[PDB]
Amino acid sequence: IIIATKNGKVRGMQLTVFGGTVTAFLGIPYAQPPLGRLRFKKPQSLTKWSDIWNATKYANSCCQNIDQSFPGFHGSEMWNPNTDLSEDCLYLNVWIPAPKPKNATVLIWIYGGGFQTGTSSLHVYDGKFLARVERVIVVSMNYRVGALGFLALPGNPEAPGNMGLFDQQLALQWVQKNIAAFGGNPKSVTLFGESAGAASVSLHLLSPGSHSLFTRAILQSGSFNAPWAVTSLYEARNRTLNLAKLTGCSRENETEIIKCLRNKDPQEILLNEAFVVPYGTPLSVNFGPTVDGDFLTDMPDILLELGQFKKTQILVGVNKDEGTAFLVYGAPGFSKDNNSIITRKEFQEGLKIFFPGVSEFGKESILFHYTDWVDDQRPENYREALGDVVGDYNFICPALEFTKKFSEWGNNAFFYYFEHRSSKLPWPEWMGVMHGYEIEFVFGLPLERRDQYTKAEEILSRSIVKRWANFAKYGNPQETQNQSTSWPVFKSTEQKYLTLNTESTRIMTKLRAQQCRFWTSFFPKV
């Protein structure tokens, strides 16, 4: 009930799940808190301790702005942090099966949130189900987000960039050294994450420093080749002094600007984060990953293209309606509380919001490819098209392109297409299979029959959880036991993928091929 780790002793708690027991260790520090002088830099090696650490409650979530666009609405507030914010938040959690296993595959979860938001404490990231049902060990970590986590003055150790990534990377180091004591196999570790998480997983495949800290990887609706994924060094620095002039820390010795930025309280930094870009976007990663030359050694699309990544198996996938989520965060004519039937002109205005610094002709090219309908007169035509535009551009096509490029170097890759809409999904129906709403299925939440899900959803989650575990333990995401569809490898030529839903799981080819050729061949040119 007490575990001796390589820098201290931690105590956990016992949880009853499905007439079994799961040991949960909630909130174990992995770094010296990045407060004071340590704000904005790489996380520092946590020195030894003496007590029995009481890891029996989630720790602090890292400082972050809150989605306040729908106060009181579960669909949005579901994602807001559910513990205190604090700069002192570099902690992690561990779920082990009871009784303590021997050489258990380990699953490491990295949340999303546009690199600005998110926390591990979330209800839909609970690792107790996965530990119970599949007797794997689940770990998840809080990493720094927003400018506290990704402010970049390239070169400068006082703020080199990618700090939240190095946070994450330090937590994988912790699992390498400490997960044995918990009964886990450091030689069998599978990273998985969602959106910004999924982009972080793909970045750990590129970053040489991470290659020895995990074996396989799962990417849910995100990859580093996504347009929001990597910030340039050009706009990163523009973004820091714009935050400095906003805080009156405009100096000229770059190191002395940082010192100024550290005696500002975290709330002042959070407030000015928004105004740092002139024309924001619902998917505006104001502070995210950069080519720091330490974690990320080159421009990732080059590393990708030239095969400069950890060779192993990937599991990649996306949801049917990735883009709808964002239309109600600004796009004109859209709301969660009506059917959001927009016209042609509301559509065009919606393009300027999603593509503000894009040529008049560039916006026109999008309108051309998505508004030559399979048939006109349909009133949702414009509403559905803008949803798909955001989805295909921001998630679906980069995921697929990443998987093609990765598979081309000889590794097994598996691609899925999640198309079930949660019966408990709080948002309306036109928004479809929303971005993010597979996570509860992956984590085994429909398995609690007390949780209002339909029986079909329990079956689907069950199969997904098995597939995810089999990929984790055996590099192969099959469900061998029940007479279910086998999941074929994604080859660059044939491009097969597996659909996931309650009805049937069919095997299809070349998802969104026409839409993706536009986005990946003739649209990067504008």
Ligand SMILES: *[C@@H]1O[C@H](CO[C@@]2(C)OC[C@@H](O)[C@H](O)[C@@H]2O)[C@@H](O[C@@H]2O[C@H](CO)[C@@H](O)[C@H](O)[C@H]2NC(C)=O)[C@H](O)[C@H]1NC(C)=O
């Ligand atoms: C769908 O609703 C939006 C906005 O509206 C609602 C649901 O919430 C906010 C309230 O202020 C609204 O009264 C309503 O309760 C509608 O968008 C508005 O549409 C008006 C007419 O087209 C315009 O004058 C407004 O500028 C515009 N506002 C925004 C923010 O877009 C939209 O018309 C509704 N759609 C349908 C089909 O009814």
Ligand SMILES: Cc1nccn1Cc1cn(CC[C@@H](NC(=O)/C=N/O)c2ccccc2)nn1
């Ligand atoms: C983790 C996750 N998985 C699926 C969905 N979510 C959360 C989410 C919320 N949103 C929409 C607005 C939101 N923007 C971003 O979080 C960045 N996106 O790139 C925000 C708005 C205002 C302040 C701070 C953040 N989009 N996703």
Ligand SMILES: *[C@@H]1O[C@H](CO[C@@H]2O[C@@H](C)[C@@H](O)[C@@H](O)[C@@H]2O)[C@@H](O)[C@H](O)[C@H]1NC(C)=O
């Ligand atoms: C850490 O926890 C110790 C034990 O906690 C108590 O006993 C266990 C068996 C549970 O029943 C738990 O709910 C109880 O609170 C304490 O004795 C100790 O003081 C704690 N130390 C710190 C620093 O909090």
Ligand SMILES: *[C@@H]1O[C@H](CO[C@@H]2O[C@@H](C)[C@@H](O)[C@@H](O)[C@@H]2O)[C@@H](O)[C@H](O)[C@H]1NC(C)=O
């Ligand atoms: C760089 O930043 C310039 C300044 O932006 C303006 O001032 C800051 C403080 C914010 O309030 C912002 O909203 C303002 O627009 C921009 O003028 C410039 O375009 C940016 N980009 C480049 C390449 O210089």
Ligand SMILES: *[C@@H]1O[C@H](CO)[C@@H](O)[C@H](O)[C@H]1NC(C)=O
């Ligand atoms: C766990 O499995 C790995 C696989 O190579 C093996 O090397 C290691 O010795 C095993 N350890 C235990 C405790 O089973």
Ligand SMILES: *[C@@H]1O[C@H](CO)[C@@H](O)[C@H](O)[C@H]1NC(C)=O
């Ligand atoms: C900036 O200030 C720091 C601290 O005073 C100093 O070490 C460094 O040499 C200065 N750099 C320049 C270019 O003046």
Ligand SMILES: *[C@@H]1O[C@H](CO)[C@@H](O)[C@H](O)[C@H]1NC(C)=O
């Ligand atoms: C396989 O089907 C049985 C019912 O015949 C069910 O109880 C079991 O949970 C299923 N297993 C998986 C992994 O879906």
